[PDB]
């Protein structure tokens, strides 16, 4: 599953009200970032589950990593990534500088590599089982090298990102 701005939490207590659980989820997600939307239903199909869509994908990833298995109203909720994109996010959308990538999948196109590097800010260019990603900023390239060291993308293989030499 690819990371997105919407994080879905399930296995929660369905005995509480919908508005109180939505306010509790908003107060829990406000510590990690700005919550743009909160989708919570109480029907027979969507019982005991909700989701929070944030502005930045990094805040949603930090909320999914930190609150993984956290006790919520007596029941430990399980957080995961969304399968599809949110409607509000789709409506709103429409060390060294060079980093060496190893053990990359050959079936991935340049758009998937751009979407993977879009967690860091704007880079100069991308080069394509080995790849070279060069960023315009040194701190952004360092954060991209520290973040992609063992990332969860195409789980049949393991991607490794290291700093380039001179």
């Amino acid at each position: 599953i690819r990371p997105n701005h919407t994080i879905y939490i399930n296995n929660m207590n369905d005995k509480i009200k919908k508005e109180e659980l939505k306010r509790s989820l908003y107060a829990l997600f406000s510590q990690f970032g700005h919550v743009v939307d909160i989708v919570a239903l109480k029907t027979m199909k969507m019982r005991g589950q909700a989701f929070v869509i944030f502005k930045e994908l990094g805040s949603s990833t930090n909320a999914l990593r930190q609150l993984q298995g956290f006790p919520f109203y007596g029941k430990p909720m399980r957080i995961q990534y969304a399968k599809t994109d949110s409607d509000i996010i789709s409506k709103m959308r429409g060390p060294n500088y060079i980093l060496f990538l190893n053990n990359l999948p050959e079936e991935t196109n340049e758009m998937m590599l751009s979407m993977l590097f879009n967690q860091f800010p704007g880079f100069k260019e991308v080069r394509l089982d080995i790849a070279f990603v060069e960023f315009e900023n040194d701190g952004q390239a360092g954060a991209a090298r520290d973040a992609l060291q063992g990332f969860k993308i195409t789980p049949s293989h393991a991607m490794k990102i290291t700093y380039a030499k001179k």
Binding site: N96, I98, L99, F100, L101, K124, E125, V126, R127, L128, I130, A131, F132, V133, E134, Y163, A164, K165, K166
Partner: protein
């Protein structure tokens, strides 16, 4: 959008922005951009892989 002879006798906004998109595409196409247009063959295998761009070569030689 700069004032050039191309944007003469053009009085509407959207026409100007569309003609600017057209001229941008044309000129950007007809230049020589070495970054994406170049054929390097890195010494990683040294007898293969000539599909390296000008950026992947630096990443491999770093």
């Amino acid at each position: 959008i700069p004032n050039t002879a191309h944007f003469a006798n053009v009085t509407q906004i959207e026409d100007a922005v569309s003609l600017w998109a057209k001229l941008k595409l044309q000129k950007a196409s007809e230049r020589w951009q070495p970054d994406t247009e170049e054929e390097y063959e890195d010494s990683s295998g040294n007898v293969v892989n000539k599909k390296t761009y000008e950026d992947l070569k630096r990443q491999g030689l770093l």
